[PDB]
Write a protein that binds this ligand. Structure first.
Ligand SMILES: *[C]C1=C([C])[C]=[C@@]23C(=[C]1)N([C][C]([O])[C]([O])[C]([O])[C]OP([O])(=O)OP([O])(=O)O[C][C]1O[C](N4[C]=NC5=C4N=[C]N=C5[N])[C]([O])[C]1[O])C1=NC(=O)[N]C(=O)C1=N2/C3=[C]\[C]=[N+](/[C])[C]1[C][C]C2=C1[C]=C([O])[C]=[C]2
Ligand SMILES: *Cc1cc2c(cc1C)nc1c(=O)[nH]c(=O)nc-1n2C[C@H](O)[C@H](O)[C@H](O)COP(=O)(O)OP(=O)(O)OC[C@H]1O[C@@H](n2cnc3c(N)ncnc32)[C@H](O)[C@@H]1O
Lengths: 499, 494
């Protein structure tokens, strides 16, 4: 009934927030709408898979908060398989390679690819992580979709097709759906194109032994019966002395403060008294989540390793159900599996099919890409379509359509009286990830602690020690990469030796 | 407790739907979240204004359904003032004119303007009203914003500025915010550029004597205590034999069917069991409403008419708080007033000011455009910012960002088991208006009537007799307008 802080939502952010508050001796209640904690992380367990992450899963270098927190909860990581060759499948052929970036031979194409990625990071450098609307050209970059930007920047179809896959993969949305400013912010705040795309030394280096769902499950264990499941919040009243929070089943909770730790658009499921301020009122109708089906096909053995393939497939073009895969085999080498994402419009389109129909399409795709009939012989299949989740709205995260981030960005984490905002969307380093979930949860908790006089303002935002288990190598660029001209820069140079 | 149909929302669409069902002998309950009916229409009454429409207001030729319905409720229209000259204010100077289109004098510019509007209507011709996503170039047109389209089409800055003002005014959103396909559909479904922009012979011809709020009020009057106010729906359960609808104050309603007659995105304020299908689930997080403050400044007299101005100002450029105005004086010639809209990003920006600060900016603006010190002497001011409305989400209506209408358009009025969808957003003629609200409410009601076996399939969509009080003259184009080349068409000819 009465406590210090009600935390709305028990995903990683809500739980990290509750934990920090509880570790400070405050009385917290977590109101979780679902019959489970974890939210957009969700580890399934059964005999066939032992365990499998059907939601968020990968962690890696620079993601120190999720790594620290999981470690304290007694969790361990292992390295995603990347020993053997990666594959880029383009125009129906596979080209095996090594290193994070699919290589390119043609010198003109090479110059355009190089400049594309370089320019993403160049542009990124002008974008404050904590205030992207302050970039010098914020409006100009916000009033254009990623599709316009790629049209402008890519002088080859090849660079454009790969850049498109990259956007689709990073943010489970189409290039024409999303703002260029927001997309560029998003990548920059993960440390740039290399850090974000890499398995070794990047965001996909590792997974947790046993599944990421353990993070929220273990904090639930620690909080005992402070975590209330099947308590969807429907109503928040801030007109009186104490904040009142009512759940759908009719329970009523009183607190000094509230943490909203749910996706920004899911705030729409709460009726507010007094009404939200105008800007948040509209903000929450303007920030949708992406579309993805996570798909895991199981095999007797990891046969691809025998062909010197690690299981990483970068798959170009419209006909492919899945554009990207990673080896999902257990660290002991059993429950051999290929993980793949069905992205954006493909999530929407292929959802009309049955589970067995999608499994067939993936197997046939993988058999072609790996050149292996063994791909046609799955032993099991698990998949989750996150578009269908009432209390997620999609996955991995919230994207910003053109014009929104400069108009409404400021509002995202601005307190509304005694409501403070956690949730990975409000993070400034790896927002969209489990990492940002922890950052934003602990920052919101601390904001409340500051409101209560327990900590000074300087302690709201707090840095994090580098994980000793997963250290970060720095990101390096060669001299040519840095200085080779772009395609139009080459044209202008050829033009100059004619005049 | 138990009835035949729960109608969620008491705005024009909800009320039209409830009325039709009641007139058929069914038992309806309207659950309205606010302490009043009307929704995006809202007539304020006080001594100073007598009455004033602070939400939806204008009606005109071809809007036969709202006209028929209002007439039946005993309501009358009068003509918006357009006797004297209109003003176009461009680069800080007023150029008075007659007719609906501001004239353009430079030859090259004239060609570019002409082609821009013409091309809007040409493009619209390939867009089915009931299925815009079936336009032959739907994906191409949907994956680009109106800003890209204008950049492509407008060879002059003047045509581009005016076309931008046009979009901002039509849909209370920025050209870079909205899909080209959706916006082109939107205009086409109101009958094209001329019909949609015109006062005489178009959407802005008329207002209702006493306020448009009376439409919903008078229906609520007819339904008595069937209309429940301050009943925000929070929950809809379709797992059992009858549909269960719970309101925030804890009441529970049972019905055979439900009509959702609220803005598509406001569906998010309802928890559903079972969950909505995947497509609707994500659809409702992708369809925001625009941004507008409606602002009405009152004067002792309609002084503008003395200078042979009617009160219509078309005002170009960033610095102007308001891009468009209309005379809001009562038909009797008193409560003289000028109505203007603060649109899109300007609604966002100027909301930071106080009421009195916005009043000042608006009087100074009107003093410049009208060339009158009299504009600086207002006797009263009413305004409403719809962005702040929890149970609207904005005004006038729902816009579609790039990519959404083709992926999710089909889903808008698709029934979800026993939930049918009204609301102006689901209409196919004057969607976004009071007209489309009636069309959509009456169609949804008839869909339920069909599901019940009372009427055949062919009766779900029903045409409407032309109003005798407000007849439509047809839209005409001259021979030159139809055949003059574009600016690149002229270049290719040279
Ligand atoms: C706001 C506005 C303004 C300011 C203006 C205007 C408008 C608006 N409009 C629109 C109208 O109004 C609309 O459409 C209608 O109203 C709609 O209806 P419906 O569909 O029915 O809807 P609503 O109303 O919203 O209702 C709903 C209801 O529900 C409820 N809820 C919610 N949620 C809930 C509930 N309940 C229970 N539960 C839950 N949960 C709410 O509350 C409500 O009630 C318009 N229209 C017309 O027609 N007219 C007019 O005038 C209008 N307006 C505008 C206009 C403008 N204009 C025209 C302009 C000028 C010049 C120009 C233009 C445009 C163009 O195009 C060009 C030029
Ligand atoms: C879905 C997904 C996510 C994902 C990804 C792949 C997929 C398919 N891969 C990731 C990865 O490999 N590495 C990574 O770091 N992140 C990855 N992501 C995203 C990641 O899962 C999310 O960023 C993270 O889980 C975010 O967590 P957060 O705590 O910030 O938010 P949430 O998980 O959605 O939790 C919100 C909880 O709130 C509940 N809820 C919703 N509405 C209510 C109401 N009204 N009342 C009470 N509770 C509510 C939800 O049930 C949820 O539990």
């Amino acid at each position: 009934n009465k406590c210090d802080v009600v935390v709305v939502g028990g995903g990683i952010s809500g739980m990290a927030a509750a934990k920090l508050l509880h570790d400070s001796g405050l009385n917290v209640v977590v109101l979780e709408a679902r019959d489970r904690v974890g939210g957009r992380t969700y580890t399934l367990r059964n005999q066939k898979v032992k365990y499998v992450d059907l939601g968020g899963s990968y962690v890696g270098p620079t993601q120190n908060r999720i790594l620290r927190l999981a470690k304290e909860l007694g969790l361990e990581t292992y390295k995603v398989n990347e020993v053997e060759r990666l594959i880029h499948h383009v125009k129906g052929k596979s080209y095996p390679f090594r290193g994070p970036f699919p290589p390119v031979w043609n010198p003109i194409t090479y110059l355009d690819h190089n400049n594309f990625w370089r320019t993403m990071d160049d542009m990124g450098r002008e974008i404050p992580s904590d205030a992207p609307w302050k970039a010098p050209l914020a409006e100009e970059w916000d009033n254009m979709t990623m599709k316009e930007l790629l049209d402008k920047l890519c002088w080859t179809e090849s660079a454009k097709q790969l850049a498109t896959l990259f956007v689709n993969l990073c943010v489970t949305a189409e290039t024409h759906e999303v703002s260029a400013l927001w997309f560029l912010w998003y990548v920059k705040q993960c440390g740039g194109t290399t850090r974000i795309i890499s398995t070794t030394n990047g965001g996909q280096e590792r997974k947790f032994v046993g599944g990421s769902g353990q993070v929220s499950e273990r904090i639930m264990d620690l909080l005992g019966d402070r975590v209330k499941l099947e308590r969807p919040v429907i109503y928040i009243d801030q007109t009186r002395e104490n904040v009142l929070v009512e759940t759908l089943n009719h329970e009523m909770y009183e607190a000094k403060y509230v943490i909203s730790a749910i996706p920004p658009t899911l705030g729409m499921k709460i009726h507010f008294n007094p009404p939200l301020p105008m800007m948040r009122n509209q903000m929450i109708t303007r920030v949708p989540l992406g579309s993805v089906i996570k798909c895991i096909v199981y095999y007797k053995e990891p046969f691809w390793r025998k062909k010197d393939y690690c299981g990483t497939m970068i798959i170009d073009g419209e006909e492919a159900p899945v554009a990207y895969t990673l080896d999902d085999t257990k660290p002991e080498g059993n429950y051999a599996a290929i993980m793949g994402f069905i992205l954006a419009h493909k999530a929407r389109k292929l959802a009309r099919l049955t589970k067995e129909e999608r499994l067939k399409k993936l197997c046939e795709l993988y058999a072609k890409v790996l050149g292996s009939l063994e791909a046609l012989e799955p032993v099991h299949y698990e998949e989750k379509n996150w578009c269908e989740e009432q209390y997620s709205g999609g996955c991995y995260t919230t994207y910003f359509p053109p014009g929104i981030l400069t108009q409404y960005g400021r509002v995202l984490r601005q307190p509304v009286d005694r409501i403070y905002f956690a949730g990975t969307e409000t993070a400034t380093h790896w927002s969209g990830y489990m990492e940002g979930a922890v950052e934003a949860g602990e920052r919101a908790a601390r904001e409340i602690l500051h409101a209560m006089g327990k900590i000074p303002e300087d302690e709201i935002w707090q840095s994090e020690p580098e994980s000793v288990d997963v250290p970060a190598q720095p990101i390096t660029t060669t001299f040519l990469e840095r200085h080779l001209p772009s395609v139009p820069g080459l044209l202008r140079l050829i033009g100059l030796t004619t005049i």
